[PDB]
Amino acid sequence: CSPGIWQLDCTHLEGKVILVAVHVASGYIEAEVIPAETGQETAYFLLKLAGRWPVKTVHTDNGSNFTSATVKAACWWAGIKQEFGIPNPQSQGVIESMNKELKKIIGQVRDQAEHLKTAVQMAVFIHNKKRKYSAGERIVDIIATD
Amino acid sequence: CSPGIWQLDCTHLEGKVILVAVHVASGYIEAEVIPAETGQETAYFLLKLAGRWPVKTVHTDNGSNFTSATVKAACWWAGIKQEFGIPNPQSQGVIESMNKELKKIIGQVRDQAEHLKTAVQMAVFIHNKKRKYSAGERIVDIIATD
Numbered sequence: 001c002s003p004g005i006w007q008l009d010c011t012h013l014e015g016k017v018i019l020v021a022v023h024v025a026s027g028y029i030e031a032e033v034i035p036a037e038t039g040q041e042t043a044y045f046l047l048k049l050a051g052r053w054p055v056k057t058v059h060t061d062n063g064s065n066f067t068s069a070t071v072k073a074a075c076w077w078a079g080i081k082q083e084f085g086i087p088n089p090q091s092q093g094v095i096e097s098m099n100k101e102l103k104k105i106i107g108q109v110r111d112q113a114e115h116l117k118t119a120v121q122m123a124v125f126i127h128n129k130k131r132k133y134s135a136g137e138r139i140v141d142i143i144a145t146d
Numbered sequence: 147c148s149p150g151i152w153q154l155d156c157t158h159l160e161g162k163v164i165l166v167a168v169h170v171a172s173g174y175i176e177a178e179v180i181p182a183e184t185g186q187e188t189a190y191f192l193l194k195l196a197g198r199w200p201v202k203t204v205h206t207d208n209g210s211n212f213t214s215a216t217v218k219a220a221c222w223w224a225g226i227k228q229e230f231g232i233p234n235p236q237s238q239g240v241i242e243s244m245n246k247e248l249k250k251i252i253g254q255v256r257d258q259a260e261h262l263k264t265a266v267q268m269a270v271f272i273h274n275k276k277r278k279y280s281a282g283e284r285i286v287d288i289i290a291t292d
């Protein structure tokens with residue numbers, strides 16, 4: 001429910017790494033394909049994310065991915081705190097479910113592009129605008145309510 | 147004023163290319179440093195932008211940058227129309243002014259990072275949260291008003 005909360009996790013597909021951020025309260029996704037998991041790439045993703053949306057707290061299923069000096073620098077600069085583990089009723093399985101839907105969609109569109117990263121961005125677009133209201137609409141509502 | 151309208155322009159700094167998208171009605175920026183101006187890079191930027199915000203129409207000060215097959219494909223897929231030239235009273239000089247502020251800020255923070263792209267993302271963050279209300283707050287309000 002809390003509106004500044006995002007969960008970041010990486011997945012591998014086709015020998016490449018997909019960084020996925022889910023805005024927990026709405027299910028809205030931002031994702032990028034990165035060459036390999038690196039503190040550098042995560043730091044840079046975080047700086048971009050935080051410049052676009054109000055990021056207060058980051059959750060993850062892999063805490064170690066946020067321990068490098070580059071990533072600490074990013075959270076420090078952007079004023080982001082990282083929760084220890086994951087403390088919640090209403091959001092149970094949301095992030096899991098969103099990551100499950102994103103992958104299903106990537107599968108459906110994969111054939112329409114040469115590059116995995118193109119397919120990822122198509123899937124992100126599809127997911128954010130999907131009317132069950134859309135994640136895209138839900139996140140704006142939450143942030144606007146102020 | 148119209149809420150689906152973004153202007154995209156490239157600038158060069160340090161022998162590198164900065165792609166800047168300004169949401170005209172609010173002054174909110176998304177920017178990335180790309181290796182060189184290429185249809186490929188623009189197409190990919192557009193696909194990401196449109197997956198995150200409702201992009202109806204793109205304006206530019208360089209129409210030729212939107213003529214490649216890659217970029218046509220992106221606008222076609224995302225349902226984006228491109229205005230011929232630029233038709234407006236209330237937005238006069240906004241995009242010019244926003245690009246002027248972004249560059250001033252890049253200058254102030256450039257020394258705090260090795261990489262230009264890091265400096266760019268710092269400047270984007272600063273610009274979007276700057277309270278005159280912020281661009282970041284204005285864009286959510288506009289999109290939410292529906």
Ligand SMILES: Cc1nc2ccccc2c(-c2cc(F)c3c(c2C)CCCO3)c1[C@H](OC(C)(C)C)C(=O)O
Nearest residue numbers: 040043044047069070073074077258259260261264
């Ligand atoms: C190359 C680099 N190396 C670092 C080494 C140790 C600690 C931080 C950084 C950072 C870094 C990371 C950040 F997240 C960050 C800042 C720095 C210096 C300062 C402003 C706010 O956020 C960068 C950074 O490049 C990256 C590609 C890793 C972002 C740099 O360009 O200097």
Ligand SMILES: Cc1nc2ccccc2c(-c2cc(F)c3c(c2C)CCCO3)c1[C@H](OC(C)(C)C)C(=O)O
Nearest residue numbers: 112113114115118186189190193215216219220223
């Ligand atoms: C490598 C590539 N080459 C192309 C050549 C001609 C026309 C389109 C593309 C596209 C493209 C561009 C798009 F914008 C796009 C689509 C394609 C195929 C299909 C879905 C919606 O948008 C890609 C694309 O890679 C880029 C890095 C340029 C995005 C690809 O991965 O195939």
